[PDB]
Design a protein around this ligand. Structure first.
Ligand SMILES: COCC(=O)Nc1ccc(O)cc1
Ligand SMILES: [Cl-]
Ligand SMILES: [Cl-]
Ligand SMILES: [Cl-]
Length: 163
């Protein structure tokens, strides 16, 4: 575990992370995809061998010794708000199981279902609160990656508001 487990947020490409493992915002079919998934595919393409996994689950594939945790958030275009909310919470619980199993002291994590799986809605708070619900019982340092300047501010505020 980390001596004093923390949450941080950085606004940059998660492919450039400084953590012991990464969470991919994956699709269920293990395809290169778009956004974070495409960045992950470019950086760690070896980790897409048999990475397909259902919605609401996480599947870890090693790129060398570097773990890539493929977490499949729901596409809110396809799910009802109720069912999508349940699957989004479930994907994060599976990330927390994998982070724990791996014994890492840090993890880089994007906000699941906030980009092209958002169904055109702002899901920062929904996705971040499911992240916290799952990750709060873990002792890894968590570094959340985002690209938008206003999202960085809002994630940073949410982290600071609970310290
Ligand atoms: C069951 O754990 C498998 C594993 O490889 N874990 C791991 C631990 C630390 C690290 O920095 C990278 C990976
Ligand atoms: Cl960058
Ligand atoms: Cl997304
Ligand atoms: Cl963002």
């Amino acid at each position: 575990g980390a001596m004093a487990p923390s949450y941080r947020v950085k606004r940059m490409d998660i492919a450039k992370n400084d953590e012991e493992c990464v969470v991919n915002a994956a699709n269920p079919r293990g395809l290169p995809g778009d956004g974070v998934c495409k960045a992950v595919y470019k950086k760690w393409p070896e980790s897409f061998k048999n990475s397909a996994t259902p919605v609401g689950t996480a599947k870890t594939v090693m790129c060398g010794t570097y773990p890539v945790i493929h977490a499949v958030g729901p596409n809110f275009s396809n799910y009802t708000e109720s069912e999508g909310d349940r699957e989004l919470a479930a994907a994060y619980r599976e990330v927390a199981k994998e982070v724990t199993r791996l014994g890492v002291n840090s993890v880089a994590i994007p906000l699941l279902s906030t980009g092209v799986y958002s169904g055109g809605k702002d899901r920062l708070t929904q996705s971040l609160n499911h992240l916290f619900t799952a990750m709060d019982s873990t002792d890894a340092d968590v570094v959340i990656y985002c690209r938008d300047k206003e999202w960085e501010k809002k994630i940073s505020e949410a982290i600071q508001m609970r310290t």
